[PDB]
Amino acid sequence: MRSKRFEALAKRPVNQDGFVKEWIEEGFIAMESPNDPKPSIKIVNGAVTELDGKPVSDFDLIDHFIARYGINLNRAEEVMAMDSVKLANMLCDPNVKRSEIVPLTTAMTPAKIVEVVSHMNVVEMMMAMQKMRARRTPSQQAHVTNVKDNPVQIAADAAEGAWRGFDEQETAVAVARYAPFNAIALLVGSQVGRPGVLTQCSLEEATELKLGMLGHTCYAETISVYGTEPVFTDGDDTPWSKGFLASSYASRGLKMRFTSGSGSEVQMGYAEGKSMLYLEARCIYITKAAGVQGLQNGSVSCIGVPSAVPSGIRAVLAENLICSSLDLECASSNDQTFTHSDMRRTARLLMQFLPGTDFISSGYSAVPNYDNMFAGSNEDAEDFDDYNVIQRDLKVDGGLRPVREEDVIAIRNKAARALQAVFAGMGLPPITDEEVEAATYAHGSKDMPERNIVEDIKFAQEIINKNRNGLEVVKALAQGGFTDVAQDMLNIQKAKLTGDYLHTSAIIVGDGQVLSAVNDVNDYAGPATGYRLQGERWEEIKNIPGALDPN
Amino acid sequence: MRSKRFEALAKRPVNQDGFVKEWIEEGFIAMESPNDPKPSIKIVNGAVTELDGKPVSDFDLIDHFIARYGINLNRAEEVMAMDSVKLANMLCDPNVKRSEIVPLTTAMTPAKIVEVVSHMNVVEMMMAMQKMRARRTPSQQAHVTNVKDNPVQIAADAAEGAWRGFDEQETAVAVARYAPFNAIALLVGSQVGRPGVLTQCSLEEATELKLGMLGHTCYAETISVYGTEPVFTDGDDTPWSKGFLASSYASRGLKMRFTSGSGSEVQMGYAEGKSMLYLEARCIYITKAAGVQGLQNGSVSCIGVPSAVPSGIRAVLAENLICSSLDLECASSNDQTFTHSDMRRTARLLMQFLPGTDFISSGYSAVPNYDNMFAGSNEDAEDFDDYNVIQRDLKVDGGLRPVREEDVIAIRNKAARALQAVFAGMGLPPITDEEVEAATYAHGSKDMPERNIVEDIKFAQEIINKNRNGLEVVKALAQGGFTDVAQDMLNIQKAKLTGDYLHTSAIIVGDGQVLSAVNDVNDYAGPATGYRLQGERWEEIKNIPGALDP
Amino acid sequence: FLTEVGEARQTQQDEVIIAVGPAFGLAQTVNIVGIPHKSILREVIAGIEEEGIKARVIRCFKSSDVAFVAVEGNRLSGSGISIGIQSKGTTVIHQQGLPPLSNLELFPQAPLLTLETYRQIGKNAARYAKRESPQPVPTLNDQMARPKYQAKSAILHIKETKYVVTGKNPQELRVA
Amino acid sequence: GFLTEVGEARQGTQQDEVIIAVGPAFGLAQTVNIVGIPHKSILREVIAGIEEEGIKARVIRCFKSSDVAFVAVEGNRLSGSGISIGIQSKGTTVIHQQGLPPLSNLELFPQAPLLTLETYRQIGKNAARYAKRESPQPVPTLNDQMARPKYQAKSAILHIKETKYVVTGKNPQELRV
Amino acid sequence: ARVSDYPLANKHPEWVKTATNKTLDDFTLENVLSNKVTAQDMRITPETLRLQASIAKDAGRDRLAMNFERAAELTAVPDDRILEIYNALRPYRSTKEELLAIADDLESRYQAKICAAFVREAATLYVERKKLKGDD
Amino acid sequence: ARVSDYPLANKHPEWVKTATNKTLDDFTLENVLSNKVTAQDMRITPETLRLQASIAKDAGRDRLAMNFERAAELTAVPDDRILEIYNALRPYRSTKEELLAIADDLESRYQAKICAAFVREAATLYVERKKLKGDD
Ligand code: B12
Ligand code: B12
Ligand SMILES: [Ca+2]
Ligand SMILES: [Ca+2]
Ligand SMILES: [K+]
Ligand SMILES: [K+]
Ligand SMILES: [K+]
Ligand SMILES: [K+]
């Protein structure tokens, strides 16, 4: 005889999630493992000889890169001698300036900073994160994709995402050969929705760089690094190849970050017996060592791995905190499905949403999750109204705003009309007036007419093989009745000339104003200081739909 | 033509919630209203002559009570002069001890402490709450009710709730004449599930005190106070009648707290143009002034009012923080429905769950919400697995644990049989073996056979009118096959003799051990100090159902 | 449809008083889900009268709280039994001698009341008047009633409250 | 045991073949993909799809990596048409082409739990038509936002064991079905 | 008593007696069944409440201690009369004279001086804030 | 340059020239439609990257500055050759001699001294850690 209470609980979505007991020998443990090395460092003649228990004669490529470029050796011995509990206390103490902490953490070893944050509970970590976040203003990044790679829908969804507040937007492709079309549609739509939104198209690394060189992207993020040598090898890179890639992006004036995240090494089969958090700390120091300004982390695509084991979502917040504490921009995930439960995914989001990070999510789905080509995000388009309500409930700036349906329809329509003009001016397969209308009123690709995919594929690849660059898109908009959009597209390209938006946490707001950690420095010093939601931004967030007036 | 994007959003549950634009004139604003008074105090010859801009000549009963009993007048002038920003900084600074803060906050006026916490975001308030919480160990409180006032189901659900970890449980009645049966069922089932769980039955005030005098409850919580004089009056009390009532419960050895909560004055029609948080601080100071050890607050039953307006859920956390900062036990709501949305109610709960309070919820529903006679709680029985998963995800002790189906079935069945013996021994309308089996495997009252409600309430009212007391229940258990339960019930009554559990935040754990803020002092001083989830308790929380073992 | 006819007076055991709040049938004419006040009175009266008991309707002014509206009703009721009804629809069956905030039966989620429930309320009231012990009206409970209607309930009550007149004795009403 | 190795794989002669390249654990450590579809069945449907389009189907096993991209690249190295199909033990599949970066592809099937034998058959049919220098309508994209929540932990565990069968330096072996 | 004496049940159970001078060890199932102890025997004493008041003061909780001192006085008032006095303090229940008589009776019959003063205070303020019988 | 000089677009736009020595103002819609500026003109310069490197150091970001100094050296390398060198650094692509000739090319032909040294460092470690052609 069964308890009907337990029958009711067995049907709950959360019991469809994947949980596992810790498996230490294969690194299936989130943090605080017995196999993790004890922090240590020895320095002779300005060169590291021992790093976290490992002598330099046993260094893998990751150890060499971190030991040579990733640690401030002038104070490493000093900071290693400090008490880890006291250091954790300094992290969440509102009266210890961010500028006083960065010289300490950047002199820590990977094991040392993991030891520091592992003394903290999630409230302490959030208290620290609101201080250690590099940019004073938090922001947000969206995915814009669909399962058909329909460029008309991408441009419309991108315009709506930019209109709702995303400052970076990311696309990806079901069919890799479509990518030039996805990149152009994303860029056009983003500039229509808000001039200055930065766009990326996530592909294999050599392919993505070439796409950037031609001018069809604004930045790149999915430049992956990994925490053990055999995993890094199967990702088709070394720390030196990825460091060279980072400098190649900058040499073309393109902003970029790395991507890592807890659980990748487990997911790819060689965790070398270490906890997810310790291996992720190696990834963060690889990023620091390469001179890359920022990092997308917080498990990202492998969220199913840490979320399966105890303290996994706390470990995800800890890896975000390590990132910001090392003075990197942190695009803090919240971009990938891990649970059937609305309660559970909300708890996971609030860890970054409440204190704020440089990008609270690094991929909120601006489309319904069925169209999300990263296999689903932790939030999607159907959550927009909940997200705004929680901003208003808690007085938290989560980067987004309530919007009017009439405005969104207009801006989606303009984005599709602008792309239609690009495709006509550049001689690409027609975008018909029926599709402009469909993209205007769509929720997702189920509302879109089918396109001739093989004709799109052929002309997308001609963009690459004939090196058709971003100036052709400017010209088409200008010859097609979109002088305003053409100018905004030109202004995005000009930002690649100044180097300004290469700096830590840089986005582009207002009338082409770069806003980075350099000129928007976080100055948190406790209550009533630091970023506060107020003024007209608060008026924007208050104005949710359905609020009845009693006057 | 209509956007299918906005068609999809219009269908979302959150868009069925009630929202309103701020209505200053009627107090429909959560905090930081331009009508709230500027903080101030003046003292002459040891008596307050002005409180927050108001002259003593114009004091209402609430001002008089707070001015005379609720503020440490030795330091109030000094504290009033301090920078409210620095005071807010001190609340969340991990290196400023709770014991350095309590002398300052208890010298503040209601407007002063509101100004302090209004400088804080919710992350800062949670950072402060984990320090100012009076009891070092967080706990949890459940509702145990059903729409039929079925006593067999109350005893079984209470036993399950105690087994899952609740340290206090509360019942209420669809038909008020049923209350003695609800109370006895709750007390019996709670002791079967874990001896020491404290129980209450929430009623009209004079009725509830009488039931407590008879020994059928262990404590009382819904002892309501209000933040304007006209609302207090419709509440059928004054600060002096509620203060006398508090001392009356203590004079019978019964633990009690008051209940307040933002938005009650708006709901009851006289907010006097003030923000919900300011009026709620008046309620917190009334509680302090009466010498009451703790307070249920965090909007509680009026949660639809602050949640309708901007920053209302932040204001709810702020009023919890004020309560703890004033060195009161805080039973921090999370006990009432306000939204159709799972995302939204989770954000509201995490404000208290993440730092911990004395009672993270003051009425998690241990029954499905269709049976919740407080009109639904912010969590219910179908959330138990999610709650345990989040504890494990975040390494946060939320007070509850995963439990085995076989253990719950056995403990529910024992509780039903124990109440069966009580009813038989007291000559109450019988509990049949069929009802015992139904309660054992029930999810809620839809699984229960119908009782003769008219006969039940006849005999329930005879318990009151013939003054049948708690020792009759002990006797029925001891003569009916349940001497173990009988001893546990007697041990509850014996705790009313010692006064130990009258103190701030007291619960009774383990082998009859009182655990209060006196002997479980919160000593938070930053990372790796204060309460930490670890050891066997962590092993218990990690063992959620369904974890594959490779 | 409601006309005052003078101060209500204490004639005996064969009557149930319906005590309505100050704005009932005046500035508010439907309850919180749009049920007309005239339809509600019709069904409550019919439930009382089908039981062989007289119904007598009074308007109360000293408080807009439905318990205190019912209490002045139960002081004047020849049977000691009364029904209190706010404009937004909240209803209680009260009895002389009980504390103001106790009762015999309470209907604390107005959005769930139907015209059928109102009729059953009048029936139960009259049976209490006859010193019978009716099976209580089956309990209505909806965990979403507060999410949907509590803010509107507060707004409607704030408005009902404006018609309170302290010290003003209750007025007997004739129904049209 | 339905796959036997006949020798080290050879650079393909003619221009009308597709190489199916399977990972080292495929068909021994596990005979079934992540959702119970028999391995023998997956070959048969992919093999059938290649041939019904008029093209030969070759099958090879790879050893140097358990990663389905590097497996496939070994196939497209030896395929006389330059087209290959990489298939992992837990079911992950990719259509690859000579000249492409190892982590690029023609078509990719990156959620193994969603693959059906019908989808496997269209893969071999599309792969052959690539070998014929046609541009087939790519297989319709399969995407389920709950695939990772349900199976990613199981995928990690399954892949962890796949990596035990990796042999540094060992060249690919030819396969008879 | 000090916080170091708390909990009395663990550190000094022999300090805890009942209204009729029974001890904690007197409350057993056998003594309940035989009526050797009864509900009247089983009530907290003013001595125990005054010990807890001392502990509250030592813990920094002066207002709580005040509450416990009021409670100590009230242990001597019967249940029926506690309820009469509580109701008499509710709004619109009493004339001023009726509340002053309660105060005198509290002091003279039960030596409950603190409670007497508290009721007199209410009586005074109920006049000004119009919470007496006939003010509704 | 110091952080007060940032952003260059706002504080010192005249410091920003292009590879072909065009100015920010030269990039107008009118000039784009008439091929008076082309994509070859629209590329960041080593001087601009070295200014940002100066600003990064002043912000306390020495590692970011070294990235920018590497990037400055790499502006001289055409797009096609950038991708060749990146690919040649990926695992198992290159012999040690091929890597060392890339480094000599970078140094001799492009004066990319830091990048050349970066590549030689990789070649040395790729031997010990077995990431060259034929080590798989
Ligand atoms: C919100 C609420 C309150 C609020 C608002 C009361 C008000 N007058 O505005 C607060 C917290 C202040 C409150 C106080 C009390 N409440 Co109340 N309350 C609720 C609750 C949780 C939800 C009702 C709701 O939101 N309905 C949805 C809205 C849209 O419908 P509505 O018709 O507008 O709701 C109104 C009525 O419920 C009314 N109301 C609320 N409580 C009470 C109690 C009584 C006796 C009366 C006549 C009316 C009443 O106020 C609501 C707003 O106007 C219910 C639980 C339940 N099962 O319904 C208890 C409940 C109705 N309350 C109850 C009680 C006992 C009380 C108190 C007497 C407790 C006390 N310590 O004194 C006081 C009475 C004060 C008063 N003057 O009404 C009991 C009634 C039991 C019974 N069978 O008689 C309930 C059922 C809970 C319980 N403990 O069992 N309550
Ligand atoms: C998890 C994931 C990863 C993980 C784990 C990969 C691994 N080998 O274990 C990480 C983050 C490490 C990763 C890296 C990359 N990924 Co990936 N990844 C995903 C994601 C988000 C979900 C897949 C999933 O969870 N499936 C559910 C499980 C249960 O089924 P499964 O069959 O076991 O899934 C496996 C495959 O998806 C495989 N895989 C994952 N990514 C890639 C990429 C390629 C080229 C191949 C052959 C296989 C592969 O890894 C999973 C675990 O074994 C998908 C998005 C999607 N739409 O599916 C992208 C996706 C498949 N990845 C993609 C890409 C481009 C990459 C990278 C090349 C990016 C880079 N910066 O180098 C690398 C390739 C590294 C490698 N050796 O495979 C693209 C493929 C685009 C295309 N049309 O070809 C996708 C579709 C996302 C995108 N940007 O569009 N990825
Ligand atoms: Ca992203
Ligand atoms: Ca409660
Ligand atoms: K990439
Ligand atoms: K990692
Ligand atoms: K009560
Ligand atoms: K209140």
mmCIF file of N, CA and C in Angstrom, chain B residues 486-538:
data_model
loop_
_atom_site.group_PDB
_atom_site.id
_atom_site.type_symbol
_atom_site.label_atom_id
_atom_site.label_comp_id
_atom_site.label_asym_id
_atom_site.label_seq_id
_atom_site.Cartn_x
_atom_site.Cartn_y
_atom_site.Cartn_z
ATOM 1 N N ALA B 486 1.824 9.008 26.251
ATOM 2 C CA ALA B 486 1.307 9.656 27.452
ATOM 3 C C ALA B 486 2.419 10.361 28.217
ATOM 4 N N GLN B 487 3.568 9.701 28.352
ATOM 5 C CA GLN B 487 4.717 10.322 29.003
ATOM 6 C C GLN B 487 5.182 11.554 28.244
ATOM 7 N N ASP B 488 5.228 11.473 26.911
ATOM 8 C CA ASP B 488 5.665 12.625 26.134
ATOM 9 C C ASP B 488 4.707 13.794 26.302
ATOM 10 N N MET B 489 3.406 13.510 26.392
ATOM 11 C CA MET B 489 2.444 14.579 26.623
ATOM 12 C C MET B 489 2.636 15.168 28.010
ATOM 13 N N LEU B 490 2.838 14.298 29.009
ATOM 14 C CA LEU B 490 3.126 14.771 30.358
ATOM 15 C C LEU B 490 4.398 15.605 30.390
ATOM 16 N N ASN B 491 5.408 15.217 29.606
ATOM 17 C CA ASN B 491 6.640 15.996 29.582
ATOM 18 C C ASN B 491 6.428 17.388 29.009
ATOM 19 N N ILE B 492 5.519 17.544 28.046
ATOM 20 C CA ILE B 492 5.166 18.881 27.566
ATOM 21 C C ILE B 492 4.582 19.704 28.692
ATOM 22 N N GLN B 493 3.651 19.114 29.436
ATOM 23 C CA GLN B 493 3.025 19.852 30.524
ATOM 24 C C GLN B 493 4.056 20.244 31.575
ATOM 25 N N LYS B 494 5.034 19.371 31.827
ATOM 26 C CA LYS B 494 6.072 19.673 32.804
ATOM 27 C C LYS B 494 6.973 20.818 32.362
ATOM 28 N N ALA B 495 7.157 21.013 31.056
ATOM 29 C CA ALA B 495 7.941 22.159 30.607
ATOM 30 C C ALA B 495 7.248 23.483 30.925
ATOM 31 N N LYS B 496 5.920 23.484 31.038
ATOM 32 C CA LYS B 496 5.204 24.678 31.476
ATOM 33 C C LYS B 496 5.438 25.006 32.943
ATOM 34 N N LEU B 497 6.020 24.091 33.709
ATOM 35 C CA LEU B 497 6.300 24.356 35.115
ATOM 36 C C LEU B 497 7.633 25.050 35.328
ATOM 37 N N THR B 498 8.585 24.883 34.409
ATOM 38 C CA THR B 498 9.933 25.352 34.679
ATOM 39 C C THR B 498 10.199 26.761 34.173
ATOM 40 N N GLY B 499 9.413 27.241 33.194
ATOM 41 C CA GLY B 499 9.627 28.544 32.582
ATOM 42 C C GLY B 499 10.759 28.625 31.575
ATOM 43 N N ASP B 500 11.552 27.563 31.400
ATOM 44 C CA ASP B 500 12.708 27.669 30.498
ATOM 45 C C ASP B 500 12.284 28.033 29.073
ATOM 46 N N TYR B 501 11.210 27.420 28.562
ATOM 47 C CA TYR B 501 10.885 27.665 27.160
ATOM 48 C C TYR B 501 10.073 28.948 26.958
ATOM 49 N N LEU B 502 9.964 29.790 27.999
ATOM 50 C CA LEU B 502 9.381 31.127 27.860
ATOM 51 C C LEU B 502 10.357 32.116 27.248
ATOM 52 N N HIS B 503 11.635 31.762 27.192
ATOM 53 C CA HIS B 503 12.666 32.690 26.785
ATOM 54 C C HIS B 503 12.720 32.785 25.258
ATOM 55 N N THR B 504 13.314 33.871 24.795
ATOM 56 C CA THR B 504 13.490 34.204 23.387
ATOM 57 C C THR B 504 13.915 33.000 22.552
ATOM 58 N N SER B 505 13.083 32.647 21.568
ATOM 59 C CA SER B 505 13.342 31.650 20.526
ATOM 60 C C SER B 505 13.309 30.206 21.024
ATOM 61 N N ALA B 506 12.793 29.941 22.227
ATOM 62 C CA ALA B 506 12.900 28.588 22.776
ATOM 63 C C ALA B 506 12.122 27.570 21.945
ATOM 64 N N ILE B 507 12.790 26.461 21.624
ATOM 65 C CA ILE B 507 12.159 25.245 21.174
ATOM 66 C C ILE B 507 12.649 24.145 22.100
ATOM 67 N N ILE B 508 12.136 22.929 21.915
ATOM 68 C CA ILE B 508 12.499 21.778 22.750
ATOM 69 C C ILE B 508 12.940 20.668 21.796
ATOM 70 N N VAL B 509 14.221 20.299 21.855
ATOM 71 C CA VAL B 509 14.805 19.348 20.922
ATOM 72 C C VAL B 509 15.329 18.144 21.695
ATOM 73 N N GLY B 510 15.668 17.101 20.946
ATOM 74 C CA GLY B 510 16.303 15.932 21.544
ATOM 75 C C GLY B 510 15.499 15.358 22.675
ATOM 76 N N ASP B 511 16.176 15.089 23.784
ATOM 77 C CA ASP B 511 15.544 14.453 24.939
ATOM 78 C C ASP B 511 15.045 15.519 25.916
ATOM 79 N N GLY B 512 14.066 16.298 25.450
ATOM 80 C CA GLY B 512 13.465 17.310 26.302
ATOM 81 C C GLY B 512 14.351 18.502 26.589
ATOM 82 N N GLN B 513 15.361 18.742 25.765
ATOM 83 C CA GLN B 513 16.315 19.828 25.984
ATOM 84 C C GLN B 513 15.781 21.129 25.396
ATOM 85 N N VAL B 514 15.616 22.158 26.236
ATOM 86 C CA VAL B 514 15.222 23.463 25.695
ATOM 87 C C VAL B 514 16.407 24.063 24.946
ATOM 88 N N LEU B 515 16.128 24.665 23.794
ATOM 89 C CA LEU B 515 17.134 25.322 22.968
ATOM 90 C C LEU B 515 16.600 26.711 22.658
ATOM 91 N N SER B 516 17.199 27.736 23.254
ATOM 92 C CA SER B 516 16.703 29.098 23.099
ATOM 93 C C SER B 516 17.896 29.991 22.816
ATOM 94 N N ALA B 517 17.632 31.284 22.621
ATOM 95 C CA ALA B 517 18.733 32.221 22.437
ATOM 96 C C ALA B 517 19.564 32.418 23.698
ATOM 97 N N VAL B 518 19.095 31.946 24.854
ATOM 98 C CA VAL B 518 19.892 32.047 26.072
ATOM 99 C C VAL B 518 21.026 31.022 26.065
ATOM 100 N N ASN B 519 20.742 29.762 25.701
ATOM 101 C CA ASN B 519 21.780 28.728 25.721
ATOM 102 C C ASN B 519 22.249 28.332 24.327
ATOM 103 N N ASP B 520 21.718 28.964 23.285
ATOM 104 C CA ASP B 520 22.166 28.767 21.893
ATOM 105 C C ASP B 520 22.334 30.151 21.258
ATOM 106 N N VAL B 521 23.210 30.935 21.885
ATOM 107 C CA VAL B 521 23.484 32.315 21.488
ATOM 108 C C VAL B 521 24.097 32.355 20.090
ATOM 109 N N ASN B 522 23.553 33.209 19.230
ATOM 110 C CA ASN B 522 24.118 33.395 17.896
ATOM 111 C C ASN B 522 25.409 34.195 18.014
ATOM 112 N N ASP B 523 26.523 33.619 17.550
ATOM 113 C CA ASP B 523 27.862 34.195 17.703
ATOM 114 C C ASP B 523 28.514 34.426 16.338
ATOM 115 N N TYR B 524 27.714 34.842 15.372
ATOM 116 C CA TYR B 524 28.210 35.061 14.019
ATOM 117 C C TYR B 524 29.287 36.140 13.970
ATOM 118 N N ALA B 525 30.405 35.823 13.306
ATOM 119 C CA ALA B 525 31.520 36.742 13.114
ATOM 120 C C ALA B 525 32.172 36.514 11.750
ATOM 121 N N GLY B 526 31.368 36.266 10.717
ATOM 122 C CA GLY B 526 31.912 36.155 9.375
ATOM 123 C C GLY B 526 32.168 34.716 8.981
ATOM 124 N N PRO B 527 32.819 34.517 7.832
ATOM 125 C CA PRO B 527 33.013 33.164 7.296
ATOM 126 C C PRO B 527 33.662 32.236 8.318
ATOM 127 N N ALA B 528 33.243 30.976 8.282
ATOM 128 C CA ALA B 528 33.716 29.926 9.175
ATOM 129 C C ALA B 528 33.383 30.191 10.647
ATOM 130 N N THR B 529 32.385 31.027 10.942
ATOM 131 C CA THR B 529 31.926 31.234 12.318
ATOM 132 C C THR B 529 30.406 31.252 12.328
ATOM 133 N N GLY B 530 29.821 31.245 13.537
ATOM 134 C CA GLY B 530 28.372 31.140 13.606
ATOM 135 C C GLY B 530 27.888 29.760 13.156
ATOM 136 N N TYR B 531 26.573 29.661 12.974
ATOM 137 C CA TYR B 531 25.987 28.396 12.557
ATOM 138 C C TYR B 531 26.504 27.993 11.181
ATOM 139 N N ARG B 532 26.941 26.751 11.058
ATOM 140 C CA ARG B 532 27.413 26.228 9.772
ATOM 141 C C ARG B 532 26.789 24.856 9.573
ATOM 142 N N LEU B 533 26.277 24.601 8.378
ATOM 143 C CA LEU B 533 25.730 23.283 8.077
ATOM 144 C C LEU B 533 26.896 22.326 7.886
ATOM 145 N N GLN B 534 26.937 21.244 8.661
ATOM 146 C CA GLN B 534 28.102 20.359 8.642
ATOM 147 C C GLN B 534 27.742 19.079 9.385
ATOM 148 N N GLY B 535 28.670 18.126 9.386
ATOM 149 C CA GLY B 535 28.488 16.965 10.252
ATOM 150 C C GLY B 535 27.301 16.101 9.847
ATOM 151 N N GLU B 536 26.676 15.481 10.854
ATOM 152 C CA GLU B 536 25.574 14.556 10.593
ATOM 153 C C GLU B 536 24.382 15.260 9.971
ATOM 154 N N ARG B 537 24.145 16.509 10.368
ATOM 155 C CA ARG B 537 23.041 17.270 9.808
ATOM 156 C C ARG B 537 23.231 17.470 8.314
ATOM 157 N N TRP B 538 24.464 17.744 7.896
ATOM 158 C CA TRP B 538 24.742 17.837 6.470
ATOM 159 C C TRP B 538 24.542 16.488 5.781
#
